[PDB]
C-alpha cells in the first residue's frame, strides 16, 4: 500500500479539516439566506415574540461568570493606581486588589477584600447597576474591547467563597469578650432587616458590640433583596448566605416586630434601656394614584408592592414557609412607569404567564431613568414600550379591567410637561401594575419616630456625614433617608452610621475614639493560618521575599515592601568601590513570549542591567537601618566580586558587619558555570563570615546540580535557584534589536525573567532537592501567586523570591500571596472540599458560566446551542418549567452549617518537597495504564480545535459532525492529550482510563 496516504475512512474523518484555497467560492445569495439560520447564535432581529418564560426563574444576568471567563476578565483588568472604578463604588471596594486576587486564582482573598468593605458583597456583585457606578469609571472604557465586568468578577469570587462554606469569625484584633469595656455591651436596636441594617449591625459587631438586635416587621429577612428583587436576578440563597455571615458575629434578629405607634417606638426602646437605634425600614408603602382607587387584584390591578412580593414568595424557596402559587397573570399586561421597578414588573409578569407586556411611561425614551442593563432585559424579552402617555382611566366591565385610557404628554419649550386632552389612547389590557415608586406614609410608623425631625420629602433628616437624626441616639440610612438608590448605597449608609453610632455610644460611657474612622476588616479562620517557615536557622514570618532586582533598586523601596507585608528582601547586588559600573539605557524590555499582548501580566521581561549603581557604603548603612526598624523581616545582602579571594572576604565581612541576616552570592551575573570556581568562592566567603550565605545559581548550565553541589561543598548554607535565562527577546522587522542602545542601536544577550521561565526554574528546584535532600533552596523564576509559590514549596524550596510579578504590578501583591497561601493550606483540612483543585471547585457542566439544566430530554440528544437545535433546547426547557409548576421544591437548611477542619492545617514545613515522590525517570512511568480523551458535549462551544489539532498534530481520531459541529473522540485515540491542551473550555475534555485494548500504531 501507499503508506503516506490516508485511507478512505480517514479521508472521511478529515472532510471538515481546513485546507488552503486556490479559488474564490461561489455561493448564491439565496442559498446563503437559508444557510444562515442553521448556525445562528444570537437573537434574530426579525423574531418579534417572547421566548416562553412561564415559571422560568433561571439566571438572566448578562454579567454572570464561570471560572474560565472570570480568569480571562481578571487578567484583562489593568489593576490601576488610584483606581477610578473604586472612586465610583459607593462602598469604596478595593477593586484593583480583589481582581488581582482573582487573576492569581486566590478567590478567598478576593472575597475577603470584597466583604471587608461590603458585607453584602455577593448581592451587590449580582445587582449593582455598575454602568452608573464602578464600571462607569473604568479606564478600559477607553479601549475598543471596553470596560471590565466588575460586577460579575465580584459575584464569581463571592460565589466561590460561599461554596467554601467558611464562617466569619469575631474580629481577632479584639480583646477577649470578658475584657471588653462595659460600653461594648450597650443595648443597640436596628429597625428593619434590609441591606442598611444588615451592614450597620455587621460593622458594629466587628467593632466588638455584643448586644445588637435587628427588629424586622415581616417573617422573612433581607428587605427588598428578598421581597421584590426577582429570583432570576438575585437568588434567595445569596441573601441567606450573607445573613448567616452576620449572625456568625452574634447579631440577633427578631421577626414579627414592627416600629409602629402601638408596638416598638423610640420611647419604648429608650424605656427598655436601648442606648442607640438605627432606622432602616426603607419605604414600605407604594406610591398610589387616585385613578386606581378601589381596584382589586381580582379585577386585574396591582401596585409593584402588591405584585413583586407575590412573585417572590412563590419562586423563592424558604422565604415564606407555606408554598404560594404564582399570580395568574394571563393576557395583556400594562406596566406603568419607567423606573427600575417597572422593568422588574415587566419581566416578572412574563414568568406568571403574561401573553404581552407594555411598559407605558409619561415622558420619552431619553427620559427613562432605569439603567441600560435593566432596560435591556425587558427589551430582549420583547416587552413593548409606549412613551409620552399619562394614565387617565381604567375601564372595568364585568368586574375585570379591559382597558386603560391615556392622554398624550409633551414638553413645550420651557421644558414644562403638559397633557394634551384631545390626544388620547385607549389601550386594551387585562392586568395593570403601577410602578410609581414607594413612600413612607403610615401615620402610626411615623408617630413611632417622634420626635425626630422630618424634612420636605416626609423623610427623617440626617446629617449626611454621620447619619445621625435630630435625636443624637437615633441614626438612619438606606431608602428611608432618600439618598440611596441602590443596595450598595444602602449598605454604605449603614457602614457610615456604624462608626458614628460607635462614637456616640462610647462618649455616653465616657470614652473617646480615634479622630480617624477605623472600621475593622472581614475575617475568617483562614486568616489565623500560620505561614511562617524556618530555614538555615532563620525565621521567616512568611515565605515571600523580594528578589535581588529592580524592585530592590533602593533601600527605601525595601522599607515600603516590609511595611506592605513582605517576609524578606534581597538588596540589589552590590560590589566594592573598585568595581563601580554604569548602567546603559534602555535596559529592561517586555517579553514577546506570549504575543502582542500589552499591559498587565507580561509573561516575561528581558534585562541587560548590571549590579547596583549605589555604593557598598549606601547598602551597608541601609541594611543596618532596615534591620534596626524591621527586626522580624529577613534582609539578605546580595554581593559580587571578581574571582579574587581578598575581595570576596572583604565584601562579605562588610555586609555581615552591617547586620545582614544572610548573604546571597551572585555567581550568575561566568564563575557560576564552573563548579571549581563556585566551590572556591563559597569557601572564601565561608571562612570570612559566620552568618548563613546562599549561592545564587545560573540556569544557563548543562547540569545545575553540579554547581549546587559545589556551593554546598564550599560551605554555602543553601542555594538560590535560579537567576535569569540567557536570551534575546527579538528584533524589529528592520533587524534592529530591542533593547537598542546608543546611536548604533546595539544590544547584548540579556536575562529572561518571569512566568516564561517558571518551567526551567521548577525543574532546577526539584532536581536540586532530589540530589541534595534537605539542602535549603530559595526559589526564584516566575512566582506570581500563592498557588505558583506552593508549586515551588512542593518542589523542595523553603522560601520564594519575586521580581517580575512586582514589575508587573506593585508591592501590595504580598497581601494576595499571604491570604492565598493561608487559604490553600486551610482548604487541605476540609474533607468536604477534597475534590477541589486548591481554590477551584470541580468544574460543573456550564454554558457561559451558567449550569446546564439536568433534564433527561436534553442529555445526549446532540443539541448544540445554536440554530434549530437551540430552538429545540428552549422548547424542552420551557416544558420542564411547566412540569415543575406542579411539584414541591425542597427547603434549604434553615441555615447551613460551616465545614470544620477534620485534620490539622499543614504548616509550610509539612508541604515542602511533597511533589518529589511523583518525580522520576521515564522508565518509572507506566506504559500499560493508557488514557483516552472524552468530551463533555454540554460544555463544548463547537470550535473544532480538538479536531484540527488531532488532524494536523495527532492521530485523526476525532469525528467533527458537519451539522452540529460536535466532536466525538473515537477508539483510535492514543491519549496524547493535545486536544485537551488546546480546548478553550476548562475541563470540557478529560483524560480517562482506557478500557478497550491498546495497540501502539507502528505503521509498518
Of 125, 199, 246, give the one whose Cα is nearest residue 495. Answer: 199
Q: Is 573 annotated as a binding residue?
A: yes
Interface mask (CB under 8 A) for a second copy, residues 187-226, using x and -?
Answer: ----------------x-----------------------
Q: Is 486 annotated as a binding residue?
A: yes
Q: Is 572 annotated as a binding residue?
A: yes
Strands 750-753 and 725-727, bridge-based pairing:
antiparallel
Question: Residue 680: what are its φ and ψ, rounded to 5°?
Answer: -65, -45
Structural element, H or E, at residue 682: helix 675-688
From the list 232-240, 251-259, 440-448, 802-810, the region that binds a second copy by CB under 8 A is 802-810
980 Cα distance to chain centroid: 25
For residue 155, state whether it binds a second copy (rule: CB under 8 A).
no
Which stretches of the chain bind ligand SF4, using CB under 6 A? 935, 940-946, 967, 983-985, 988-989
Q: Which does 262 bind (CB under 5 to 8 A by kind): a second copy, ligand SF4, ligand Y3G, none?
A: none
For residue 314, state whether it binds a second copy (rule: CB under 8 A).
no
Q: How far is CA 730 from CA 609, 692, 749, in A?
A: 17, 39, 11
38 contacts: CB under 8 Å, gap ≥ 6: 867, 868, 963
CB 967 within 8 A of CB 958: yes
| Closest distance to ligand Y3G from the beta carbon of 751 (Å) | 3
Q: Which does 989 bind (CB under 5 to 8 A by kind): a second copy, ligand SF4, ligand Y3G, none?
A: ligand SF4
| Closest distance to ligand SF4 from the beta carbon of 142 (Å) | 9
Q: Is 154 annotated as a binding residue?
A: yes
Give me the torsion for CA of 479, 482, 483, 488, rounded to 10°. Answer: 10
Task: Tell me the C-alpha distance between 825 and 821, whole Å.
Answer: 6
Interface mask (CB under 8 A) for a second copy, residues 848-867, using x and -?
Answer: xx---------------xx-
From the list 134-142, 242-250, 666-674, 761-769, the region that binds ligand Y3G by CB under 6 A is 666-674
Question: From the list 609, 656, 717, 938, which residue makes contact with ligand Y3G (rule: CB under 6 A)?
Answer: 609
Binders of a second copy among residues 889 to 928 (CB under 8 A) are: 911, 914-915, 918-922, 924-928
Q: Which does 210 bind (CB under 5 to 8 A by kind): ligand SF4, a second copy, ligand Y3G, none?
A: none
Nearer to ligand SF4, 613 or 936 (CB): 936
886-891: long-range pairs with CB below 8 Å, 24+:
888/323, 889/317, 889/323, 890/317, 891/317, 891/318, 891/321
Nearer to a second copy, 218 or 951 (CB): 951
Q: Which residues of 537-548 are buried (b: 16+ CB within 10 A; e: fewer)?
A: ebebbbbbbbbb
Of 254, 276, 252, give the one whose Cα is nearest residue 263. Answer: 254
Q: Which does 876 bind (CB under 5 to 8 A by kind): ligand SF4, a second copy, ligand Y3G, none?
A: none
Of 679, 606, 4, 261, give the one whose Cα is nearest residue 697. Answer: 679
Q: How far is CA 1001 from CA 559, 631, 974, in A?
A: 61, 64, 9
Question: From the list 559, 645, 874, 896, which residue makes contact with a second copy (rule: CB under 8 A)?
Answer: 559
Q: Which does 176 bind (CB under 5 to 8 A by kind): ligand Y3G, ligand SF4, a second copy, none?
A: none
Q: Which does 372 bind (CB under 5 to 8 A by kind): ligand SF4, a second copy, ligand Y3G, none?
A: a second copy
Of 633, 644, 628, 651, give the one whose Cα is nearest residue 552. Answer: 633
Of 140, 37, 40, give the one whose Cα is nearest residue 83. Answer: 140
Q: Which does 303 bind (CB under 5 to 8 A by kind): ligand SF4, a second copy, ligand Y3G, none?
A: none
Catalytic residue, candidates 200, 669, 671, 988:
669
Partners of 725 in the β-ladder: 752
Task: Tell me the C-alpha distance between 798 and 400, whole Å.
Answer: 78
Task: Tell me the C-alpha distance between 564 and 545, whole Å.
Answer: 12
Binders of ligand Y3G among residues 154 to 183 (CB under 6 A) are: none
If binding means CB under 6 A, how many residues of this protein chain bind ligand Y3G? Answer: 11
| Closest distance to ligand SF4 from the beta carbon of 79 (Å) | 11
For residue 751, state whether it binds ligand Y3G (rule: CB under 6 A).
yes
For residue 424, state whether it binds a second copy (rule: CB under 8 A).
yes
| Closest distance to ligand SF4 from the beta carbon of 65 (Å) | 18
Q: Is 217 annotated as a binding residue?
A: yes
| Closest distance to ligand Y3G from the beta carbon of 723 (Å) | 5
Strands annotated E in 537-624? 538-540, 544-546, 568-570, 588-590, 605-607
Nearer to ligand SF4, 598 or 922 (CB): 598
Annotated catalytic, 669? Answer: yes
Strands 662-666 and 693-696, bridge-based pairing:
parallel
* Biggest CA-to-CA distance, the chain: 110
Q: How far is CA 880 from CA 327, 870, 884, in A?
A: 19, 15, 6
Task: Tell me the C-alpha distance between 588 and 46, whole Å.
Answer: 55
Binders of ligand Y3G among residues 668 to 687 (CB under 6 A) are: 668-669
Nearer to ligand SF4, 193 or 983 (CB): 983
If binding means CB under 8 A, how many residues of this protein chain bind a second copy? Answer: 296
Interface mask (CB under 6 A) for ligand Y3G, residues 718-747, using x and -?
Answer: -----xx-----------------------
Strands 605-607 and 588-590, bridge-based pairing:
antiparallel
- Positions touching ligand Y3G (CB under 6 A) are 573, 607, 609-611, 666, 668-669, 723-724, 751
Residues marked as catalytic = 669
Annotated binding-site ranges for [4Fe-4S] cluster: 77, 80, 85, 89, 128, 134, 138, 154, 940, 943, 946, 950, 973, 976, 979, 983
Annotated binding-site ranges for FAD: 127, 192-196, 216-224, 233, 259, 478-487
Amino acid at each position: 500500500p501507499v503508506l503516506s496516504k490516508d485511507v478512505a475512512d480517514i479521508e472521511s474523518i478529515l472532510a471538515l479539516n481546513p485546507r488552503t484555497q486556490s479559488h474564490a467560492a461561489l455561493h448564491s445569495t439565496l442559498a446563503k439566506k437559508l444557510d444562515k439560520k442553521h448556525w445562528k447564535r444570537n437573537p434574530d432581529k426579525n423574531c418579534f415574540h417572547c421566548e416562553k418564560l412561564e415559571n422560568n426563574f433561571d439566571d438572566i444576568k448578562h454579567t454572570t461568570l464561570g471560572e474560565r471567563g472570570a480568569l480571562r476578565e481578571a487578567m484583562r483588568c489593568l489593576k490601576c493606581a488610584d483606581a477610578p472604578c473604586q472612586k465610583s463604588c459607593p462602598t469604596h471596594l478595593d477593586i484593583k486588589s480583589f481582581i488581582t486576587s482573582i487573576s492569581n486564582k486566590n478567590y478567598y482573598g478576593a472575597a475577603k477584600m470584597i466583604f471587608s468593605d461590603n458585607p453584602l458583597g455577593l448581592t451587590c456583585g449580582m445587582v449593582c447597576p455598575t454602568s452608573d457606578l464602578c464600571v462607569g469609571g473604568c479606564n478600559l472604557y477607553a479601549t475598543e474591547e471596553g470596560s471590565i465586568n466588575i460586577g460579575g468578577l465580584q459575584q464569581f469570587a463571592s460565589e466561590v467563597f460561599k461554596a467554601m462554606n467558611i464562617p466569619q469569625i469575631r474580629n481577632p484584633c479584639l480583646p477577649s469578650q470578658e475584657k471588653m469595656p462595659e460600653a461594648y455591651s450597650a443595648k443597640i436596636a436596628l429597625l428593619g432587616a434590609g441591606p442598611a441594617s444588615i451592614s450597620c449591625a455587621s460593622f458594629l459587631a466587628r467593632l466588638g458590640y455584643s448586644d445588637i438586635t435587628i427588629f424586622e416587621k415581616q417573617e422573612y429577612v433581607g428587605g427588598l433583596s428578598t421581597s421584590e428583587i426577582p429570583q432570576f436576578r438575585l437568588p434567595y440563597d445569596v441573601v441567606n448566605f450573607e445573613i448567616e455571615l452576620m449572625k456568625d458575629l452574634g447579631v440577633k434578629i427578631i421577626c414579627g416586630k414592627s416600629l409602629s405607634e402601638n408596638e416598638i417606638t423610640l420611647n419604648t426602646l429608650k424605656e427598655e434601656g436601648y442606648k442607640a437605634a438605627f432606622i432602616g425600614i426603607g419605604l414600605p408603602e407604594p406610591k398610589t394614584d387616585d385613578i386606581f382607587q378601589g381596584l382589586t387584584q381580582d379585577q386585574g390591578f396591582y401596585t409593584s408592592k402588591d405584585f413583586l412580593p407575590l412573585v417572590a414568595k412563590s419562586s423563592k424557596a424558604g422565604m415564606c414557609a407555606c408554598h404560594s402559587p404564582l399570580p395568574s397573570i394571563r393576557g395583556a399586561v400594562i406596566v406603568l412607569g419607567a423606573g427600575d421597578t417597572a422593568f422588574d414588573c415587566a419581566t416578572s409578569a412574563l414568568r406568571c404567564g403574561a401573553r404581552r407586556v407594555f411598559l407605558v411611561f409619561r415622558k420619552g425614551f431619553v427620559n427613562i431613568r432605569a439603567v441600560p442593563e435593566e432596560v435591556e432585559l425587558a427589551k430582549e424579552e420583547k416587552c413593548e414600550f409606549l412613551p409620552f402617555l399619562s394614565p387617565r382611566k381604567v375601564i372595568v366591565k364585568g368586574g375585570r379591567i379591559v382597558a386603560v385610557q391615556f392622554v398624550r404628554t409633551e414638553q413645550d419649550e420651557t421644558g414644562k410637561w403638559n397633557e394634551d386632552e384631545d390626544q388620547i389612547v385607549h389601550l386594551k389590557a387585562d392586568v395593570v401594575i403601577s410602578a410609581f415608586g414607594s413612600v413612607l406614609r403610615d401615620p402610626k410608623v411615623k408617630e413611632a419616630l417622634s420626635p425626630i425631625k422630618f424634612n420636605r420629602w416626609d423623610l427623617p433628616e440626617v446629617d449626611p456625614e454621620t447619619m445621625q437624626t435630630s435625636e443624637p441616639w437615633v441614626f438612619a440610612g438606606g431608602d428611608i433617608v432618600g439618598m440611596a438608590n441602590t443596595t450598595v448605597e444602602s449598605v454604605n449608609d449603614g457602614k457610615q452610621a456604624s462608626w458614628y453610632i460607635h462614637k456616640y455610644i462610647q462618649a455616653q460611657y465616657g470614652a473617646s475614639v480615634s479622630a480617624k474612622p477605623e472600621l475593622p476588616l472581614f475575617y475568617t479562620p483562614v486568616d489565623l493560618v500560620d505561614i511562617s517557615v524556618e530555614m538555615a536557622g532563620l525565621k521567616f514570618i512568611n515565605p515571600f521575599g523580594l528578589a535581588s532586582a529592580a524592585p530592590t533598586t533602593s533601600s527605601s523601596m525595601i522599607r515600603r515592601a516590609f511595611e506592605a507585608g513582605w517576609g524578606f528582601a534581597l538588596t540589589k547586588t552590590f560590589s566594592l568601590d573598585k568595581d563601580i559600573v554604569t548602567n546603559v539605557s534602555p535596559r529592561i524590555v517586555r517579553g514577546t513570549t506570549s504575543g502582542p499582548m500589552y499591559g498587565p501580566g507580561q509573561s516575561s521581561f528581558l534585562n541587560i542591567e548590571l549590579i547596583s549603581e549605589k555604593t557598598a557604603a549606601y547598602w551597608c548603612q541601609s541594611v543596618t537601618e532596615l534591620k534596626a526598624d524591621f527586626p522580624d523581616n529577613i534582609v539578605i545582602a546580595s554581593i559580587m566580586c571578581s574571582y579574587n579571594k581578598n575581595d570576596w572576604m572583604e565584601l562579605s565581612r562588610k555586609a555581615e558587619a552591617s547586620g545582614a541576616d544572610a548573604l546571597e552570592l551572585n555567581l550568575s551575573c561566568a564563575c557560576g558555570q564552573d563548579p571549581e570556581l563556585v566551590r572556591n568562592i563559597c569557601r572564601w566567603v565561608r571562612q570570612a563570615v559566620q552568618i548563613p550565605f546562599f549561592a545564587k545559581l545560573t540556569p544557563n548550565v548543562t547540569d545545575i546540580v553540579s554547581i549546587a553541589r559545589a556551593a554546598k561543598e564550599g560551605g554555602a548554607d543553601g542555594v538560590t535557584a535560579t537567576n535569569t535565562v540567557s536570551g534575546l527577546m527579538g528584533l524589529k522587522a528592520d533587524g534592529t534589536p530591542w533593547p537598542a542602545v546608543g546611536a548604533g542601536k546595539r544590544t547584548t544577550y540579556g536575562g529572561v525573567s518571569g512566568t516564561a521561565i517558571r518551567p526551567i526554574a521548577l525543574r532546577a528546584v526539584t532536581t536540586i532537592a532530589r540530589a541534595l535532600p534537605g539542602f535549603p533552596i530559595l526559589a526564584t523564576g516566575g512566582i506570581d501567586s500563592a498557588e505558583s509559590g506552593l508549586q515551588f514549596l512542593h518542589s523542595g524550596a523553603s522560601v520564594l523570591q519575586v521580581c517580575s510579578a512586582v514589575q508587573n504590578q506593585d508591592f501590595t501583591v504580598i497581601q494576595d500571596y499571604c491570604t492565598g497561601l493561608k487559604a490553600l493550606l486551610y482548604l487541605k483540612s476540609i474533607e468536604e472540599l477534597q475534590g477541589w483543585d486548591g481554590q477551584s471547585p470541580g468544574t460543573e457542566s456550564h454554558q457561559k458560566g451558567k449550569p446546564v439544566p439536568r433534564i433527561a430530554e436534553l442529555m445526549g440528544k446532540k443539541l448544540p446551542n445554536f440554530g434549530p437545535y437551540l430552538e429545540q433546547r428552549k422548547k424542552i426547557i420551557a416544558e420542564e418549567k411547566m412540569r415543575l409548576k406542579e411539584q414541591n421544591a425542597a427547603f434549604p437548611p434553615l441555615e447551613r452549617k460551616p465545614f470544620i477542619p477534620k485534620k490539622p492545617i499543614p504548616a509550610i514545613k509539612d508541604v515542602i518537597g511533597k511533589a518529589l515522590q511523583y518525580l522520576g525517570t521515564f522508565g518509572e512511568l507506566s506504559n500499560i495504564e493508557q488514557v483516552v480523551a472524552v468530551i463533555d458535549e454540554e460544555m463544548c462551544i463547537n470550535c473544532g480545535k480538538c479536531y484540527m489539532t488531532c488532524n494536523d498534530s495527532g492521530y485523526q481520531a476525532i469525528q467533527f459532525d458537519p451539522e452540529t459541529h460536535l466532536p466525538t473522540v473515537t477508539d483510535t485515540c492514543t491519549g496524547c492529550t493535545l486536544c485537551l491542551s488546546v480546548c478553550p473550555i476548562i475541563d470540557c475534555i478529560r483524560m480517562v482510563s482506557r478500557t478497550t485494548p491498546y495497540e501502539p500504531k507502528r505503521g509498518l
